[PDB]
Amino acid sequence: PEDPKWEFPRDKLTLGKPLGEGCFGQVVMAEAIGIDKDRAAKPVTVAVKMLKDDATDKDLSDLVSEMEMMKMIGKHKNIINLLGACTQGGPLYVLVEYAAKGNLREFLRARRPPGLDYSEQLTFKDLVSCAYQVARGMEYLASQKCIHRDLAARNVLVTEDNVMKIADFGLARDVHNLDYYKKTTNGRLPVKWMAPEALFDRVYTHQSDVWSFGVLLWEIFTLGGSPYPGIPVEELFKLLKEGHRMDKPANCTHDLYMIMRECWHAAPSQRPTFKQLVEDLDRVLTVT
């Protein structure tokens, strides 16, 4: 179906360097002339998401659904914003703000301290800021009655300005009706970030995102450490069922570990909301 307000003209888009690929599509850098509705003759660098080379009918419907998930949500500073879409006469191209500095996982990894033997930095305060930014975006997201379901450092992107922008509405779900989502189906899932109720019982909520945010905290304060490294899905299950929790990172203050562990209550309803997480991180950002 047509949507003239988002429609963007093919002849104004030059596809550029590939960036990598997600689940439903691949991403390239691109030049889009006058994307900056305003002024106007100037080419803006954007990201373009399009079908992969081996794409199924489902990938197409998922990519459209992801596009829609974005049109719904609305604009927020801490969310990757939709910019437009070539949907007519040629492949689907979805046009989206470019984050120059890549995803957060590699961002953090890239600025680990090298050796003294090997070859700005980042402060503790920088790390809490990232946590906060993501908390704010998830807060906005939740209030738009939508669930992320894929929240992880690799799914936050960083602008030239070091602004965190949540991305990958691949598994994102409009929840306006019920205020939760139930899977009942089978597919490929980000298991090491997933709350027990979501993993074992297929129930998703803003509260299962909160558990995941927990894991993103761990990722931030380890500077892109991998949760449960090498441990196979067989064994994650085992560890969760026993109520294992990840250890406190060296760089983590006690305060922040409490926020972390709080996100990992067994009972969903005992976890803070994103609203509270914003509050808690604001405070901690404040005392630093």
The amino acid at 229: P
User: What 3-state class would DSSP assign to 146?
Assistant: strand
Strands 203-204 and 181-182 turn out to be antiparallel
Kindly state whether residue 32 participates in binding ligand EVR, applying the rule CB under 6 A: no
Cα–Cα separations (whole angstroms), residue 67 to 24, 120, 196, 217: 11, 35, 29, 28
Q: What is the largest CA-CA distance in the chain?
A: 60
Is 193 an interacting residue with respect to ligand EVR (CB under 6 A)? no
- 20 binds ligand EVR, rule: CB under 6 A: yes
Residue span binding ligand EVR (CB under 6 A) among the ranges 9-17, 90-98, 181-189, 225-233: 90-98
In the bound state with ligand EVR, the residue whose beta carbon lies nearer, of 155 and 212, is 155
User: CA-CA distances (angstroms) from residue 112 to 246, 249, 251?
Assistant: 21, 14, 12
Scanning 4-12, 34-42, 151-159, 263-271 for contacts with ligand EVR by CB under 6 A, the matching segment is: 151-159
Q: Is 49 annotated as a binding residue?
A: yes
Residue 167 engages ligand EVR in binding (rule: CB under 6 A): yes
Rounded to a whole number of angstroms, the minimum distance from the CB of residue 186 to ligand EVR is: 21
Shortest CB 167 distance to ligand EVR, Å? 3
Shortest distance in whole angstroms from residue 101 CB to ligand EVR: 7
142: which residues sit within 8 A by CB, 6+ positions away? Answer: 206, 209, 273, 274
Identify which range of 7-15, 154-162, 178-186, 202-210 contacts ligand EVR by CB under 6 A. Answer: 154-162
Q: How far apart are CA 258 and CA 217, in angstroms?
A: 11
Tell the smallest beta-carbon distance from residue 155 to ligand EVR (Å): 5
Active site residues: 150
